[PDB]
Amino acid sequence: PIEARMNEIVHSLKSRGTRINFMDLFPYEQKEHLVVTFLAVLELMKNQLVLIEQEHNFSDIYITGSE
Amino acid sequence: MRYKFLSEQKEDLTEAKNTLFQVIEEMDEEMTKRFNDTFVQIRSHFDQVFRSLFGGGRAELRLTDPNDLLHSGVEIIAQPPGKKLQNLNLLSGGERALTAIALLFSILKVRPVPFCVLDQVEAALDEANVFRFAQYLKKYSSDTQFIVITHRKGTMEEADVLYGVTMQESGVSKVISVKLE
Amino acid sequence: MFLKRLDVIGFKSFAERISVDFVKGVTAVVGPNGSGKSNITDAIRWVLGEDIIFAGSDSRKRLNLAEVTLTLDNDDHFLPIDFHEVSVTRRVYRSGESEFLINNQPCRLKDIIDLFMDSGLGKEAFSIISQGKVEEILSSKAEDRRSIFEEAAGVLKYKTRKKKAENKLFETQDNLNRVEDILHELE
Numbered sequence: 001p002i003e004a005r006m007n008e009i010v011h012s013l014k015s016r017g018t019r020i021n022f023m024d025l026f027p028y029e030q031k032e033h034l035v036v037t038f039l040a041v042l043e044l045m046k047n048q049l050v051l052i053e054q055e056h057n058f059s060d061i062y063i064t065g066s067e
Numbered sequence: 068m069r070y071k072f073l074s075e076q077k078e079d080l081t082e083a084k085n086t087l088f089q090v091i092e093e094m095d096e097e098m099t100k101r102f103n104d105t106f107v108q109i110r111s112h113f114d115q116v117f118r119s120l121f122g123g124g125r126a127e128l129r130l131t132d133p134n135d136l137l138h139s140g141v142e143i144i145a146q147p148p149g150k151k152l153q154n155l156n157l158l159s160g161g162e163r164a165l166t167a168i169a170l171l172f173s174i175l176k177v178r179p180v181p182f183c184v185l186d187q188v189e190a191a192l193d194e195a196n197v198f199r200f201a202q203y204l205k206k207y208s209s210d211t212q213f214i215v216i217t218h219r220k221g222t223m224e225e226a227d228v229l230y231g232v233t234m235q236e237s238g239v240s241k242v243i244s245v246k247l248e
Numbered sequence: 249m250f251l252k253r254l255d256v257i258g259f260k261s262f263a264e265r266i267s268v269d270f271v272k273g274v275t276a277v278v279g280p281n282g283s284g285k286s287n288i289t290d291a292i293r294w295v296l297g298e299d300i301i302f303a304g305s306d307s308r309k310r311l312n313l314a315e316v317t318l319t320l321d322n323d324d325h326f327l328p329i330d331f332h333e334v335s336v337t338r339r340v341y342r343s344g345e346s347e348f349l350i351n352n353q354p355c356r357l358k359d360i361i362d363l364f365m366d367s368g369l370g371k372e373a374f375s376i377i378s379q380g381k382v383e384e385i386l387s388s389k390a391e392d393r394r395s396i397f398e399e400a401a402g403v404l405k406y407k408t409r410k411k412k413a414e415n416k417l418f419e420t421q422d423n424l425n426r427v428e429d430i431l432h433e434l435e
Contacts, residue, residue: 098398183377234283
């Protein structure tokens with residue numbers, strides 16, 4: 001299940017006003033937590049709720065709500 | 068009326084038959100020997116690979132007809148830990164999938180490849196077996212580069228990096244990436 | 249040898265250029281079902297020689313061409329070709345034309361197929377494994393599972409040669425039968 005995670009990203013996107021670095025979306029993330037967050041972001045991208053920017057492979061990922 | 072060109076065509080047929088029968092015979096000899104030699108090598112790995120993936124149990128490969136090495140089937144008999152030893156036909160859906168993966172990974176020990184693309188091969192595993200499948204990949208990724216298409220979270224947890232493919236705009240795949248290691 | 253990079257443009261759902269850098273260990277490819285992760289495997293299958301062009305979306309029109317390039321590290325000279333890095337390129341145009349390249353040099357599809365077959369990675373190599381192979385193993389038909397053991401044993405070239413010879417014998421006899429029939433209606 002990733003919908004519960006998806007909730008928290010949308011909520012953490014509204015609390016903040018603008019960008020968020022993916023690594024900062026959650027203060028600290030264990031490997032298991034990172035995977036579910038990553039899958040959550042991909043699902044939010046598919047539902048046209050989040051804008052993503054990444055310059056190269058494995059560069060930092062910036063998240064922005066869509067409204 | 069007899070024709071020379073027809074007589075020659077018949078002689079040529081007979082001549083070609085003599086050589087082509089020898090080709091066919093040698094092909095049968097190559098297939099029988101290579102099938103059996105390879106079967107012996109795969110069998111030599113199968114129980115160990117099975118046990119690594121299931122966390123116990125035991126398993127065996129057996130030729131259905133050892134005296135017909137051109138056509139014999141292969142029987143697979145396996146005992147998932149906590150269960151009875153049975154023909155693969157009678158095991159659960161998840162046990163069957165993992166046993167097939169154990170055979171494929173035993174084949175990889177006999178016929179190694181530098182890279183291996185696994186496209187959702189573990190879709191049918193019981194959730195409780197995914198971690199040992201994922202640990203197997205990590206362990207043997209020193210000798211085989213693994214590119215793993217997967218929708219099982221336990222497999223992702225053992226990857227070195229993740230590529231995420233998703234359609235932000237309809238029909239158009241976007242790709243992002245993150246290192247776990 | 250290992251895979252370095254997969255570059256994809258215009259292939260199925262990859263309307264925008266895609267560039268996957270593989271690591272030497274485990275690279276996982278994930279995402280929503282149907283969002284294209286399985287087209288990574290198809291692109292690799294396609295460029296190795298074993299409906300292709302993006303056909304349009306709500307925001308995009310269909311493309312005129314699809315291109316995949318697979319870059320391989322060849323430091324150990326696993327591939328029988330005298331380059332440290334090997335590039336294999338396959339292109340297909342809307343018009344039906346196809347282009348094939350190895351290290352940017354035009355070649356035939358057969359040249360790509362032969363390069364990998366000669367290195368030991370032909371049809372029978374288990375370098376790509378999908379649920380189809382699991383299905384073969386799990387089949388109730390004995391010949392389906394035997395086929396997997398035959399691939400492992402590399403008997404395909406012997407089976408193909410045997411069939412080619414059996415076909416030559418049949419064709420030669422059929423031709424003689426046809427000639428004799430024509431000659432008989434002449435009597």
